[PDB]
Symmetry: D2
Amino acid sequence: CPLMVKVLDAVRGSPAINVAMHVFRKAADDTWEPFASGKTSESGELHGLTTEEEFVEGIYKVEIDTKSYWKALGISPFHEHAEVVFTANDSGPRRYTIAALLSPYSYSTTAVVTNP
Amino acid sequence: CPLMVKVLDAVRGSPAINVAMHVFRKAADDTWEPFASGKTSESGELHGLTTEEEFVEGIYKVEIDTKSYWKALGISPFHEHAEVVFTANDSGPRRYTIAALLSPYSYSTTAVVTNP
Amino acid sequence: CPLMVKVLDAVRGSPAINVAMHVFRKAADDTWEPFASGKTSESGELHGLTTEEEFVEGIYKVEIDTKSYWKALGISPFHEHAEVVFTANDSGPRRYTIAALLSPYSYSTTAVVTNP
Amino acid sequence: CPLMVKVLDAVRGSPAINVAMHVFRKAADDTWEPFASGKTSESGELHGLTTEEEFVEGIYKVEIDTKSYWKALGISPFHEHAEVVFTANDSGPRRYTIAALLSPYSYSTTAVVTNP
Ligand SMILES: Cc1cc(OCC(=O)O)cc(C)c1Cc1ccc(O)c(Cc2ccccc2)c1
Ligand SMILES: Cc1cc(OCC(=O)O)cc(C)c1Cc1ccc(O)c(Cc2ccccc2)c1
C-alpha cells in the first residue's frame, strides 16, 4: 500500500471501527476531486485506497468522518470531520501511513513516511 | 471574545509565533465564505477574530498555515495546513478556544468550549 | 511564577477541574523528595507551586492524578496517573508551563519553556 | 503478545527505532520491580516482553528512554523519559498495545486494549 490510514479511539481504548473516509486530489483549478474512499476495518485500518502508479505527485486530502463515528456511539462530538492535507511524493514515491487518534473534542494526526 | 486560537510548537517547547490562519463560514449555498483572519502573537494566541453578534450559528473552518511556519524554520513538514471544522453556537452562544500543538509530521487539535 | 500546570479534558472539551497532582524533586541520594502539591482550579490551572528562589536546578516529577478524575466521572481509565519528569533550570532560571490533555485511554503532555 | 509497544517520531515522520524501555511491576511494598526490557525494532515496535501466564493482574510501569533517543538525533529534549503506568487485566487477560508519539517537548500515549 502506498497509502494506509489507521484510526484509534481514545475513549474506548480500541481501534476506531467502521470510520468512513474520502480521499481527494487537488485539481488544477484548486477544487478537490474525490477519487477514493472506504471505511476502517475491525483493526481500525483502511488499505487499498490507491496503487503506486496512480498515486502521483500532488496535493491530497483525507477527510475522516469522525462526527458519524461519535454519533454512532451516542457521544457529542466537536468536529465535523478530521482532515489531513498533504503533498505526496515530492521527492519520489513513498509509503504513507496516516495515524489518527480520536477523542470527542480533540484529534491528533501523524504521518509515517517510509521509502520503499 | 467568542473565538480564540492558541498554537504551540512541540519541537521548540514554545508558542508558535506568527502563524497565519483564515476562518471561513459555510454559507446557505454550501460554499466556504471568508469570515476572519490573522496571525498568532508572541504568545501563540490570536484573539479578536469576531464578536458575539457576528458569530452566529453555523459551520466554521479554521485553516492554520502550519506549512509556512515550518518552512520559515527550514523544515519541510508533512501537512499543508491544520484544519479545524466545527458547528458553533448550535445550543446558544459559547466561547471557543481552539488549541493546536504542532510538530513537523503531526498535529493535534482540541477545543475548550465554555458557556458565558 | 516559574511552574504552572494546565489540564484539559478531551471528552468534555473543558478544563479538567479539581485534578490533584504532586511534584517531587530528585535528591542527591537519588530518591524522590516531595516538593509541592495542589489541585487544578475551575480553569484547569494550578499556579503557586514554587518560587524562583526555591525552584533550583534539578530533576522534577509532576504526578497528575488522572485516575481519580475519571473515576469521579464514572469512568475506569487506562492510566493510574500522568507523569511528567524533566530537568529544570539547567541553563539558568526558566518559566515552565506543563500542559496535559486527558482522555480515558490516552494522554498527551507538552511543555512551554520561556526565558524571563 | 499480551503486551506490545509501538513508538513513532513526530519530527522525522517515522517509527522511533532503537528506543530502549523497561517494564516494572509494582511490588507489595510499593516499590517498582523491573522485570522486562527491550528496544524498539526498525518498525518502532517492541514485542515479546511477557507471556500470558506471567502477565498477571497488578500495576505495571513502562519507562521509555526518550531522552537517549533525542540525544542520539542531536535534538534537545524536555523529558527525562516517558512513563506509562496502568493496572493490567483488572477484569481478565487483555492484549495491550501501548502507542507513543514522540516530539522533543511533547509526548502522547494511548492504549489499545483488546479481549482475545
Ligand atoms: C498502534 C498502531 C498500529 C498500527 O498497525 C498498523 C501497522 O502496523 O502498519 C499502526 C500504527 C501506526 C500504530 C500506532 C498509532 C496509531 C494511531 C496514532 O494516532 C498514533 C500516534 C499517537 C500515539 C499515541 C498518542 C497519540 C497519537 C500511533
Ligand atoms: C488552551 C490553553 C490555555 C492556557 O491557559 C494558560 C496560559 O495562557 O498560560 C494555557 C495553555 C498552554 C493552553 C493550550 C494547551 C492546553 C493543554 C494542552 O495539552 C495543550 C497542547 C495540546 C493542544 C492540542 C491538542 C493536544 C495537546 C495546549
